[PDB]
Each structure stands twice: as C-alpha cells, then as structure tokens.
Amino acid sequence: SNSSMNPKSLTDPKLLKNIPMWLKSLRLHKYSDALSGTPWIELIYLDDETLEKKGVLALGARRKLLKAFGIVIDYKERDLIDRSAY
C-alpha cells in the first residue's frame, strides 16, 4: 500500500531489531517470516536475489527492499542509528 521507506522507522532499532515490524512500515511484513530470520544489519545488506531466496519472490517487493536497505545503511553509516540495534 504505502512502502515509501520511512527513514524514521528504517533507522529506529525498534523496527531494525524487529525486522517483521521493520517491514510493517514497508508494507512487506508479507515477507516478515522470510526476512525475520535475517537482522537489519544483514537485511540492509541483502539484495533482490537474496530476498527471493528468503521468500520475497515479487520482483517489485524485493528489488524495492533494496531501496530500504540503503536508507538504513547510510543513516547507519552516519551513526544516526543507535549502536544498540547493531
């Protein structure tokens, strides 16, 4: 529905530690079970291909998650994300 990649949630250890929840703000909780087994630090590092391997078969959904992966990384790179999430 939305999946506009909220830089607020994508960089809040609350969601990050709770990937499913992290996906909630991305409308990809659909793949929560497939992406839950993987933390944010790894999620944000995944790729369209890996996502497929998990369960994200939607070229639209996975390739899209790659957008959420970056916003998290950069902010993670800018120490904008609590080291607690790490």
Swiss-Prot record:
Cellular location(s): Cytoplasm, Cytosol; Cytoplasm, P-body
Residue intervals of the SAM domain: 14-75
Highest taxon in the source lineage: Eukaryota
Segments forming a coiled coil: none
UniProt miscellaneous comment: Present with 3200 molecules/cell in log phase SD medium.
The record's note on its domains: The SAM domain is essential for RNA-binding.
Family stated for the protein in its record: Belongs to the VTS1 family.
Purpose of the protein: RNA-binding protein involved in post-transcriptional regulation through transcript degradation of SRE (SMG-recognition elements) bearing mRNAs.
Subunit and interaction comment: Monomer. Binds to RNA.
Name of the protein in question: RNA-binding protein VTS1
Organism listed in the record: Saccharomyces cerevisiae (strain ATCC 204508 / S288c)
Gene name, Swiss-Prot/TrEMBL: VTS1
